[PDB]
Structure formats: C-alpha cells, structure tokens
Protein: Benzoylformate decarboxylase
Organism: Pseudomonas putida
Amino acid sequence: ASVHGTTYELLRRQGIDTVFGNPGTNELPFLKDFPEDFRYILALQEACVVGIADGYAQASRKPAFINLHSAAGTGNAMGALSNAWNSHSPLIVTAGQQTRAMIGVEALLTNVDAANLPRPLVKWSYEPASAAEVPHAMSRAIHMASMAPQGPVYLSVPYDDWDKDADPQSHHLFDRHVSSSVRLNDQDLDILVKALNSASNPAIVLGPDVDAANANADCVMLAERLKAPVWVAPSAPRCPFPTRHPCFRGLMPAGIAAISQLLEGHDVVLVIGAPVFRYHQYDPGQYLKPGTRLISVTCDPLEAARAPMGDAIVADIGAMASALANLVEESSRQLPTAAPEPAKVDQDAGRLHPETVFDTLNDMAPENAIYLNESTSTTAQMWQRLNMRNPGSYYFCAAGGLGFALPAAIGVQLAEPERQVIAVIGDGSANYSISALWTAAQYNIPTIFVIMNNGTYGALRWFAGVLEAENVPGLDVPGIDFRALAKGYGVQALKADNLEQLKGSLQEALSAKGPVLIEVSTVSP
Amino acid sequence: ASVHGTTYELLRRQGIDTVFGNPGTNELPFLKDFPEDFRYILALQEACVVGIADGYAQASRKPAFINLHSAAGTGNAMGALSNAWNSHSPLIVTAGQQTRAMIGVEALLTNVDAANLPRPLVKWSYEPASAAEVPHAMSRAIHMASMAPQGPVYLSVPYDDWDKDADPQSHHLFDRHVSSSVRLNDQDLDILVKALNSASNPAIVLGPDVDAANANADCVMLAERLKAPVWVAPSAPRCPFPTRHPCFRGLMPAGIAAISQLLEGHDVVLVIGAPVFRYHQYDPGQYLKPGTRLISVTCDPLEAARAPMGDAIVADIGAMASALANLVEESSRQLPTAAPEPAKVDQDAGRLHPETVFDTLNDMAPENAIYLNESTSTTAQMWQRLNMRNPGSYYFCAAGGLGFALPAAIGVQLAEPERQVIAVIGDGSANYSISALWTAAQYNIPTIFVIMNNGTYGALRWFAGVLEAENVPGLDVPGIDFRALAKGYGVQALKADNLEQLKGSLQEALSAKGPVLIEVSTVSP
Amino acid sequence: ASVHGTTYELLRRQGIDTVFGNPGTNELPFLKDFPEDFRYILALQEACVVGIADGYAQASRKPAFINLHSAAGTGNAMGALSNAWNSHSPLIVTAGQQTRAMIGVEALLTNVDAANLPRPLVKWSYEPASAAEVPHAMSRAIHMASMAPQGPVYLSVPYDDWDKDADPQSHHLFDRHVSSSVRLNDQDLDILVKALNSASNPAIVLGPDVDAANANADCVMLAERLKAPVWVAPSAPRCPFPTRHPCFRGLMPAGIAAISQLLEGHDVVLVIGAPVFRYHQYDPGQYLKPGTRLISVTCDPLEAARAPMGDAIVADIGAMASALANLVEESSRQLPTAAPEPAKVDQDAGRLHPETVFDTLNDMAPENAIYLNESTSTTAQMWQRLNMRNPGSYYFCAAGGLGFALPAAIGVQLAEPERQVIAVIGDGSANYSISALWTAAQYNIPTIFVIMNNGTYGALRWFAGVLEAENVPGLDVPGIDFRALAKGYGVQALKADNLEQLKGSLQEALSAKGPVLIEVSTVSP
Ligand SMILES: Cc1ncc(Cn2c(C)c(CCOP(=O)(O)OP(=O)(O)O)sc2=O)c(N)n1
Ligand SMILES: Cc1ncc(Cn2c(C)c(CCOP(=O)(O)OP(=O)(O)O)sc2=O)c(N)n1
Ligand SMILES: Cc1ncc(Cn2c(C)c(CCOP(=O)(O)OP(=O)(O)O)sc2=O)c(N)n1
Ligand SMILES: [Ca+2]
Ligand SMILES: [Ca+2]
Ligand SMILES: [Ca+2]
Ligand SMILES: [Mg+2]
C-alpha cells in the first residue's frame, strides 16, 4: 500500500472523515484521489479554515483534521491556533512541505524549521524523517491531539512522501485505542468527598473543560446534592451549566480581588475543569480571603502547576464529575434560590441597546440554540440575558483572539445540524475572518450571524476610559457595510436599525433555509 | 523621562514616524498620548497590518514599525511574516504583553513563550527582562531589522513597562548609526573584476536584493559594459532591471534543469542579490552544465551557505554593484539585442485573456506605474507584457504566501504617492487579506486593484494537471462578488466583462481620486 | 559514490583533515573506513572533545570538525559550546542519530528534536530530510561555521544515511569558495579615516576578533600612526596586541562606570573586533562621559545591535584593520610612553603568590609561548606580568565557562607544534575537564599544565566578600591531589611548594618531551 492509502485508512479507522483545508501545491499529492467516504470543507483563508475546524471539534467533542499550505498557510492560522490552545481543542493540523529533494536548497514553498513554526501553540509538532514514517507520525498526531489535556498538534509532510510505499507493519496503528479517562484513586477520592460533605458553605466554579467533557449534567447533580452556588470561571470559552438553574450565579469577574471577595465566607471552593484563574484586568488583592480554601480538578498539568493557590487534582473531568456527583451526600441545607431575571433596559425607537438585542434573541431563539460571542463590550449582558439550558450552547475565543466566532459558528452549525447557531459578533471583530462567510454559503450551513454595529472597537474605548488614556489612535472602524460584505460572499443579508426591524429580521432569519447575516445598528459607547 | 517618552524619541531619532497596527488592551499604554509627529495606520486584521507595512518598507527602502496585540494578533500575522522573511523586509514587529504581575498566572491575553512564537520567521525575537530595558531592546530591534541582510524582528513588551522610569543613560541610543554598507576587499575585488573582464560569454542574474538596494542603475551599467544578457532569478519578489532594456532576457524558469540549460555556453554567470536558486517545481538535472561556473554576490550568509554550486561573496548589494559597474572594462563585444515584443493573443468580445489584460495595462498605465502580482497562473505573461523601466515597479509574495499583494499595494502606494500602484490579483488570492481594502478607503490611498476572476484556483488546477492528479477537492471558488466586497469596505468598484469594459474601467480608475477595484472576467483554465 | 565517500571528499576539498570526537554506535557507520589522510583525535568526554577542537580552531584560524554521540554526547558538550559561541569559534559539530526507520518509535539513542538541542548556542542547527541531502547539509555547515561572524554549527545525521547513494550533483559542493572578507565602502571609509585623523586624543580598544583575524600587526601600525593608547576590551578571550608595546594600556575593568572613567578626555574611541562591552560586575554609571564618542568595528551584527552607545560598522576585522592602518595619517603627536614594569611582590620561602608564578613564567618561558588562563582570581595579575609580543598567545573562556583551558590548551598545542603552550589553571577549574589530560598523554601533545592550588574557589570567595554575603556553602575544594590525577591519565607530574621548586619544576617541564602537569601551592585568599 502507499503512504497515501495507509494514512487515509488510519484516519477513517480512527473516526476522521472530514478535512478542513485551503489547498496548495505541496498538498496536491495528499488531496489527489480523495476518498469518497471523506468530505473536504474549503475556506478562503487559513484563520477561517482552522476556526471552522475548531468550532466543529469543540461542538462534536472529537478531533478535527486540518490541511494547510506550508509555512504561509500555517502562519495565517496561528492566531486561530492561539485560541485552540487555550480551549484545549483537539485539532490535527497538517501542512504540506516541499519534496525532500528540494528542502535543502530552500526552494519556494519550503517550510523552514517547520516544527518550530507553530510552537508554542501546539502540544506536539513534527516532521517525519522518512516517507514510511508518515502513518506512524499521523498516529502520534491523532493521539496527542485527543489525549487529556486535549489540544492542537502539527504535522509537516514532504509532498513526495505520499506516493511512497508504506511500511507493511503500519496496520498495527489502525485500531489503536488510547484512554485518558481516569479519576482520583479510591482512598484520596474518599478524602475529597468527605471534605465536600463536611463543608459548611461550599461553592462550585466550573470551566470550559466541563462542557467539553459533557459533564454538565453531573455538575448539576453535584451542585444539587451539595446545595452549592455555581459560578462560571472568568474569561469563559464555553458554558458548563444551565444559566437558569437555581444554583447558577453567573460569570465571575476576571479580577483577583473581585473573585476573592465573591468567594468570601465560602469555606471550600471546588473548581472543576477550569484554570485558576483566568484573570484579565489587573485587580490586585488577596487570591483568597481568610477562611476560604480551594480545590481544583483539572485535566491539564500546566493549569495545576500555575494556580497561585489551592490544592489540585489532575484527572479527566468527565470521570471526576461523575464520581463526585454520585458519591457526595445529599446536604440537608436549603437549595440556593434562583437569580432574578435581568431588568428590561429602556429602549427608544432608535439604535438598539445590546441588552435589547439579547432579550429579543432569548425571546425568539429555539430553546436549543447555540450562541457564539465575539461582541467584546457586551459579554456581561449576554451571559445575564440568554437562557442556555443545554450543553454546547456557548463559545467564545479562549485566548481572546478575534476572528474566532464567525468561522467557528460555521463549524459548530456543521457539527450540530439540528441546533440553530447564532453568532453575535461586533463590527470590529467581524472583519478578522470575514471570508469565512463564503464557506457557509457554499455548503449551505445555515448559521445566523448577528453583527452588532456601533462603529467602534467599544471594549478598547472602555479600557482606555479606565486608564484615563487620552489620544489613543485606531479605535474607530466607521464605513463598513456588512450587508454588502455578506452579498459579496453569497450570504442573505438583512439590516435592523430599530427593534421593529430586529424582530422582523430575526423572524426571517429563523425561517430561512440558509445562512443569514443581520446587521444591527447598536448604540455607541 | 518615562519608557514611553524615551522609546518614541528613540523611534523618531531613528527615522520612524509611522505605526502600522491593529490595537488591543496590552497596547493601550503604548499608544496613549500618541505623538503628534507620528501617524497611525489602522488595518482590520493583522495579516493586513503587516502586509501594508511590508509594502511600505520595501518601496521606501527603510524599516517599518508595526504594533500588534499579544499572541493572537502576532499569530494572525505570521503568514505575512513568512513573505517578509523571504523578501528581507526590514519590519520591526512589536506586540503588547500582559502586565508583568500577571504573566505568571497566564491571565487572558498573556503571550506565553512570546519570543518563540514568531520564530523561525524573524532575525531576532525578544522580551525585555525589565521596563528600563525597553528602549535598549527597541534599539536592538531597529538595528537588527535594518542591518544586512534585512529582515523582520519581534519585540514583546509588558504593558506596565511604558509608564515606568526610563534609564537616564538611554539617550546614548538615540543617534546610534550602524552601517553594513561593505564590499569585497580591494585584492579579491580585483580578482573578481579580472574574471569578468576575461569572460568570453558572461551572463548576469539579478535578484530582489538588487531592487531593494536601488542598485538597478548600476546593474544596467555593469551589463552594458560586459555586453551581457541579464535574467531575473526565479520566483522573483521584485524587478531588478528594465524589462525593455536590450540586455534583458526575462524571468528564469524555477527549475534546476531549466536553468542549467538556459545558462549553457555561458562561461561565467554572475548572480547578484538573489538566492541560488529559488526553484519551485521539481526539475531534476545538472545544477550547471560543463563549462559554466557561477559567482554569487549576496547580502545573506544563509543564501551563500545553501547554494548548491558556485563561489559566493557576502556583502552589501549596493556597494558591490556600484564597485563592479565602475571597475569592469568596456567589452568590445556587441551589445545584446532586445527581445522582440510579445505577440498579441486572439481576443473575442467575451471573457478576457490574461495576456489581453496585461497588454491593456501596459498601453494605459503611466510609465512610472508600480505593479503587484498575486495572479498566480499568469505570472509568466505579466513579466513578458509589462514595460517596467524604473526601480520599485514590481512586487510579488517572496514566500509564495497569498494575502500579500492586496495590503502590500496599499503600503506601496502610501510610500510612493506620485506613482500609480496597480495590483493584479486573482479571485482566489483576493480573499486572504480582503479587509485590507478598508484601509485604502479610510486613508484615501488611491491604489487600483485589478481582480482577475476566473472562478478557480487556476495555478492549482494546472499543477494538478501536470501531476495527472484526479479527484482533487477544493480547487474552485465560485460565487464571489468582488464589487460587493469593495462596496462593503468603501472602495469604488467597477466590472469588466470584455475588452471594451476593461478599457473603460481603466480610464475611469486612472482618473479617480481614490482607490478603485475593478473585477475582470477572465477566461477559465 | 556513497554519502560516506562524498562527505569525506567534501571535507578534504574544504581543507578539513581532522576529526575531534568521542564515538558511539550512531557514529560507527560514519567513522568506519576512516580515510587514511584523515586523523582522529579521541577525548574521553564531550566537553573535552569540543574544548580541544575549540583551541585547535582558534589557534589555527580555521574550522575544526567534531563528531559526537547523539543527544547525550551533544549535551555533555554544550558548556563548551557556550564558550565557542562567545569566542566566534568556527566549529562544525556533527552528531549521530538513530536509523531513520527507528526515529519515530524513539528507540534508545534517538536524538529527539535534535536541532533544538544545541540552540541557542549555534549559528545553524539542522538534520537533513534524506540521506542524499547529507553532503549538501555538510556544505552548509562548513560555510555557516566559517563565514563572519564565525561560530559553532550543528548537524545531526541518521546512521543509515552514510551507506546510501549520494546525489551525482554533489560534486558542485566540493570546491565552493565563500568570502566574507569585506570592508566599508570607499566614501564612508574616507569619512571614518578623516574622523580619526582629526581626533585630538583618540583611544583604541581591541577585542578577540582582532587576534582571530591576525589583525594584530595592522592594529600596532594603526596605533602607532594615531599615537593612541590601546586597551584590550573587558573579559578578554584572546590577546590582540603586544603587551609590552609603548601604546599598550592593558585589560579594561569589566564595569560600565570604570570604562567611562578610563575613556574620559578621549574624544574618539575606536573599538575593533570586540563587543561593546563585555561587562561583568555591576558598575552603574555613564556608558561614556561627555566629550567622548565611540565608533565600533565588529564582524557580528548581534554585537553592533546591542551596543548601548556609539556608531558601528559591521565588516571583516582583517580587511578593516588593514585598510585603516594604511589610510590614516601619521599623527605629529608624541607616541605614548610604555607602561612601567610590574612591581615584584614580597615572597617568602613558603606558598607562592600568583604574582610570583607569573613573573617566573615570564622569566623562563620562550618568547613565543602561548598561555591559557583559567585561574579566575588572578587574571588581572596575569595580564600585567606576562610579556606576549606575538599573536595567538592568550586564550580564556569567552563565556566564563570553566572546563575550557585544560582541553583547549591541548588543541592549541596541536595547532602550534613549535610554540610552547602553558595553561595556568586553578585547582577548582582543573576538575571540570580533567579527563582531557589523557588526550595529551596518548597523542604526546606536550602542553604544560600549571595548576594553581589554593584549595578554594577564590574568585567566588572574593565576589562573596564584596556582597558581604555570609554563610555561602560550596566554596572550598580541599583534598585534591593533582599529581595523582595526572598519573591516572599518563601525564608526568611535578609539585612546587615554594619558589625553589617552582623554578626547578619549570626547568624540567620546559625540557620534557611530553605533557607535564605541575601542581603549585599558592597562597589562600
Ligand atoms: C486578533 C486580535 N486583534 C486585536 C484584538 C484586540 N481587541 C479589539 C480590537 C477589540 C474590539 C472588538 O470590537 P468589536 O466591535 O468586535 O466589539 P465591541 O465594540 O463590543 O468591543 S476587543 C480586543 O481585545 C484581539 N483581541 N484579537
Ligand atoms: C496563504 C496561502 N494559502 C494557500 C496557497 C496555495 N495556493 C493557491 C491557493 C493558489 C491559487 C491562487 O488562485 P488565484 O485565483 O489567486 O490565481 P490563479 O487562478 O491565477 O492561480 S496559488 C498557491 O500557491 C498559498 N500559496 N498561500
Ligand atoms: C562551568 C562553570 N561552573 C561554575 C562557574 C562559576 N565559577 C567558579 C566555580 C569559579 C572558581 C574557579 O576557581 P579556581 O580554583 O579555578 O580559581 P580561583 O581560585 O583563582 O578563583 S570562577 C566562576 O565563575 C563557571 N564559571 N563555570
Ligand atoms: Ca463595535
Ligand atoms: Ca483564479
Ligand atoms: Ca582555587
Ligand atoms: Mg513559532
């Protein structure tokens, strides 16, 4: 068999059937004779390719396979890889290299130093030393991406390798099963359970890794048994809990002092599937107040090492959440009371307040909608106003890297054909990966894109307001016509200048058979 | 003085007055109190930021200063950095880092391992160990980017550094002058000159570094004195010679066997300011034929080391070209005859042949136009059909990385306000950095964008045709409306479906006061 | 031809005839059928291998070829590579890799990530993508090591590559000549010369790169014409000037404030072939005093970039020194007066004062002796007391990395069979590369090793005295018998407990036919 044939067999035997890519000449020998059981999803730029794959992987809870062109293609994607790293997204990034005979002279399209290019944003990066090694290296890539803590990996392949004879012994790779589904040993797990059972006022903090593991339901049970309030860890890339559950307390402020104040009086704080902590703004203070101790369960040694406080357990989030939910006692304490609904903000017949947009979305969207957020100045409001009862209902750039939500919303919609995806993206953010729209059009992936247009990089104007920073250039982005951009890429486009039109546009979008972009005129900050 | 004040003074004292950027919160403390003598050029995505800066640097023949946001912003730009590396573009890339107090915990927006991120595509990559070091590190960056062989460099700065007190001794940085304007010693230069003088049938091969040095005129003189044919080295990122000069022989084929055949019978081949060689397609054969010896002058040790044949001299291209042009004797040989004009291809009243487009451009454009090429299947024709008599008249992604020409054409037009820039870009390539259009609109930089629309990734269909590769997915890009995209970003848009309309559109574009995009319906391959 | 045969031919055609190594199984296929015209120099540990090669390269002023075993062998040498980096030593370090078929599984002896191992201490690091590429990669290594600024480079080769068929076109590599012998262009050189000619009180500062280039004699001439005092740049790895010349002012203190004070009143300071500056101790102050300006000539862009003050020219030191020495005018100023001889320190009939040892060496050694220094607390005295009139007469770990002088003295003696090498090494430093002695014994390389034994890490006790640091552990090294160590490795050993015995031992050593070690009982600090 050829390296080509063996590699495709390894992929399908490992459950991979889709290639997200933007092609080049180094990749032609790989893409030729494309398997009929495989599907190729083209995007027009590599940040879009990787973003779509990322959304697909996160929503599907399985690895996504990517094929990019050499150094330039890989480099175009490395902003996307920065989010993928922070979101533990299992992405297998392959890139084509020049033929071995021409790597030395550095012919055009040679990926020099290839493995070093994507670092430090990958778990594993490699170029095989011979054609026969390619399937083995692909096996390594598949497993490195998939093992806890999941993450992106990189494989560079000289284009002449594909047609070479494969090693007959490569068949041993095909059905390899590797498991990291592990939990704390019985003795120490009992100690933990006893500590939660004995807590007088426990609190729970959940991260994105909870949603990735589909441990949401177990976390509800654990919270119910412990009669404990549940917060989402700061800078949240996913939603790990029903936002309308009586225990839910919302998104934590991304500040050291703010979080210690919030947790004050809680004697034991159990953090599950989240970094400790993902702070953002500088909020000097105590990491924890006297009387509060912290216990973190994380799938990622790097997270456990860098936590500035608390004990930590490195294990699988699914296995740990299941175990805890089932072991802990049913506390006699009174179940926490549900947070009151958000107030309705005054709204005139003009520009729309972000709050109004989210209320309307909540009123009109299906109960199993999936939201993506890249409207950076309205995150707090979005979390307060959208009722997300099911898992996999929220996605936000884990590294704060813009250009995520637009493509990722397309990958999410591809992974969940029966759940309406609605991406809420600011006018600034929309541009980073605008060409992603074309993929939704071409494959008729019916994502709804809600563009929040206030003409400025609002979150930056705000941060600059706090720093009392004057004379900062480059904060306004006037003069963009998002309906024209959507038309340019074949996506149906609507405009909403007021509530009447917002309701009308949403009704039309929700009834449409393909992707739709709605440009919303929001108030200026 | 503050680190902020000292750094801006260092920049202006070193001739930098423009910041190409896309801002973030880590960068606010740097951008605040922006100097009135400085100018900020905003682009909507980092590949566009770096591409514009790249064109500006190459055309201006000086370093360009870039400011990006942390890891995600830097990563979005690394495809652009791959071209910059191959084109020796002096780019000073700065990125904002999290405050020092929060780097350890890996707060959101922390650039982890920052210096390793942009490698291997930079000459120098660094994050200073203290705020007071920032000006010194900026000095290092400026000089590393500017010294031969020029190239991109990377500096990461924690945002809390800017307001800190600068080291009083930093003033010694301000007026530092560093020179790499060097040439071969007298004795060995005389030996070289004697070898050229004694050559019976010399040939000259010029690379992009010739145009970068403005050594074009000296190369004409050298060619005239030696009565030698002049070729442009393969995969040419710039134009180093008048394409209508009697000595000019055009662009070399990017193949080993093709080049040795071309040079057969030439006893001495002098290569100046070019890699040896930038091959592309695999064309196995002799590097040089018996009787041909090669001498390379290059500014880049890496080029000299990796040449598979010939002698090499590592020195400044400007200094070497001047010295050779002035020292060599005036050969009694007959001056080479000028290549005959390209034939006129049959053109009906329908879709336009690439050849027709280039002939029309040549007929209508000013004699001092500057072209950019990202129409990958029509490169050979472009070189044959465009009369470029002056330096700085051609630019093409040095690393083959698409997404270059659109933004770079804007930077070129900014650097050369009196020379009409015309970017010829295929429908595929146009998408990679489409959002760059907005910058041309906002700053009224009057670049003309000619979009060659044949609905496919033509060069890939061709390479696949040679490999007889069947069933390759992802090669067609139908359904893009480039006039709508231009409208989306505020650029005047025209359409040319035939020659009559092409002539009309060009006439309008050439008379316009701002940027214009013309979508041209070209024939399908 | 085989890759083995082609590579050895490339080496000999490029002037390499010696392999410094410590062998392993990955290297057997390379070392087998060892060429009869080649010579193998074995050392017992890799720090010793590289140190011997380093001394050989520096003294011979040509590249030295090294062969080490995989990761462990390369890693044992990386302390040696840190000195080599700082001394611009042209070292070609090759290491054997596992067979390509077993690199994937990470068999024992696999060098994982090989090219990344030696960074950042090499100019170039590489593992070829195929056997046929090996000669081309070796060519790249040879030239990267040899081009200005010279430095160590690293090449990893899978052991199965050697027996494979070489590319017939590799013959083009054999006689490649690459030159970096360049100097400042005429116009700017004239400007420099005019500035030196106009200087009212110029001073000259020389670095190791001057001795490496053999530019010593030209620097004497330049100093004589300018009637200028000459200092050696701080932390000096070599001696660039006759220490008894009327212009010589000795070794500069390694402190910022000390150097600016020293240069005060000098209007133009010309630094040649040295970093600016290699400081050591923290001596806060002005980099230069008002009225002093600095001009640096360096072969190394990295040095020019990081100088905190002055103008810089990046060019070949040999070419620049020759040009300046020959162009500058003969100043009418009075030639500087020669520094007075060092005073004779009081010495009883007991332990020897370092000063006494150096005076005695100066009295007894041939005028063309070559010294090495790794007696860290007595450097200042050594420089004052040893008359070194010729080039290549002094070597000291450029990176301050101990374990250099012992092996390097053996390589120096190998390169200069007619010049008596005398290494002066403290009892602490002697241990780092003690096994190097065996190589001197086995090959009868007649280096003299003078061990300065005061029982302590003296320089550390001193630095700790300045920091008033109390309770520092690990500063004493009692209980080492250096005569027994020498006997262990087959080197004749003597002991000197007083001046009478020191004189006697030196007389015997100087008359000996092989290597000799003399243990000297020096006074405790
Ligand atoms: C790739 C990238 N570039 C730049 C930024 C910096 N940045 C920028 C540019 C922001 C403004 C986003 O503006 P928007 O219009 O999408 O939303 P708001 O107006 O609600 O802030 S938020 C922020 O962190 C980033 N995070 N990622
Ligand atoms: C960033 C990047 N991605 C992918 C490619 C691969 N690629 C692609 C996608 C090409 C087709 C460009 O199509 P076009 O429409 O711009 O021009 P033609 O139709 O004339 O080829 S040429 C080529 O090398 C690339 N070079 N750079
Ligand atoms: C490889 C290495 N390890 C440790 C040191 C630290 N070190 C040490 C250990 C010194 C003492 C050398 O002691 P010595 O006996 O050779 O000489 P003195 O007694 O004259 O200082 S000097 C110094 O920098 C070093 N420079 N290099
Ligand atoms: Ca906005
Ligand atoms: Ca096309
Ligand atoms: Ca000692
Ligand atoms: Mg990298």
Q: What stands out?
A: The domain at 341-525 of chain B is CATH 3.40.50.970 (Rossmann fold). Residues C 79, 375-378, 400-403, 426-429, 432, 454, 456-460 surround TZD (ligand 3) (CB under 6 Å). Chain B is about 35% helix and 20% strand. Residues 202 and 268 of chain B are 5 Å apart (CA to CA).
